Amino acid sequence: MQNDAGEFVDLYVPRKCSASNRIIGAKDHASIQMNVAEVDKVTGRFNGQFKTYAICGAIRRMGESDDSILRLAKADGIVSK
């Protein structure tokens, strides 16, 4: 949140979900920050570089997370062709 002076007045910018683009609440204890790391070339070396997939509570309870992780990583190109 900005004013006319242009200052950052907001306390914290919460996690927007990667499934349904919904704001994860501060008391939403059913949320998760999935973490999947990158894989190197033919030699197959582990990297410290990783990508974070925020999945919120109602998606996790309805079960849309299982389809959502694969349909999000398919746009990345890391799960399949």
């Binding site: 998760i32 894989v39 033919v42 309870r61 299982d66 992780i69 694969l70």
Partner: protein, 215 residues
């Protein structure tokens, strides 16, 4: 990619354990994992989309920093044998038997952990860690079947968790890929022991019978 592809030894071990066959009932989120129905009720799960979820489960487990932050839970005896030899081998903390519900919730009990990742065997037999995930904020990897619910589940690996050989093959090959990602075993190196430890052992009737037949 190009090294994470399945090979002939891998598909020979999958068809030997018989993980291509599943249950008879369907689920509304297993349609993308099933391939085609078959007569006599038993349905067919494809192998490539199982290998990809095994790969993502291995990526999730190797993405941890403290190996004590990964808990492995199974309540049925077809998985309790595999958990103790799985998690004590490479990178996790095992617990089996009775779950003692309320384990990850209250802090008056000395049996309290803060896992940053969870791998369970059967969701229907392990509904209680799925319930307690909502207070600890942990991900969940589950060896699911064609008739298992997918509440509080992040990675679902479609399989048959009834037969012990498929369960032991999946724990074996999951630890195999975890160790090849961590760097203990190279890619052009087979595993040193045959996984029956991970599968099952029938107790002392036919075990001592086979021992007396071998001696």
């Amino acid at each position: 990619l190009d090294v994470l592809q399945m090979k002939e030894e891998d598909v020979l071990k999958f068809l030997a354990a018989g993980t291509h066959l599943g249950g008879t009932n369907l689920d509304f989120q297993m349609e993308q994992y099933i391939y085609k129905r078959k007569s006599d009720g038993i349905y067919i799960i494809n192998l490539k989309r199982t290998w990809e979820k095994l790969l993502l489960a291995a990526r999730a487990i190797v993405a941890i920093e403290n190996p004590a932050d990964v808990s492995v839970i199974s309540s049925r005896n077809t998985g309790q044998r595999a958990v103790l030899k799985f998690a004590a081998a490479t990178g996790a903390t095992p617990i089996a038997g009775r779950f003692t519900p309320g384990t990850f919730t209250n802090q008056i009990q000395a049996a309290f952990r803060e896992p940053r990742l969870l791998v369970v065997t059967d969701p229907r037999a392990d509904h209680q860690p799925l319930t307690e995930a909502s207070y600890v904020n942990l991900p969940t990897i589950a060896l699911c079947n064609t008739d298992s619910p997918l509440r509080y589940v992040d990675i679902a690996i479609p399989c048959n968790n009834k037969g012990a050989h498929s369960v032991g093959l999946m724990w074996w090959m999951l630890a195999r890929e975890v160790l090849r990602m961590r760097g203990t075993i190279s890619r052009e190196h087979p595993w040193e022991v045959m996984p029956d430890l991970y599968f099952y052992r029938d107790p002392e009737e036919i075990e001592k019978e086979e021992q007396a037949a071998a001696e």
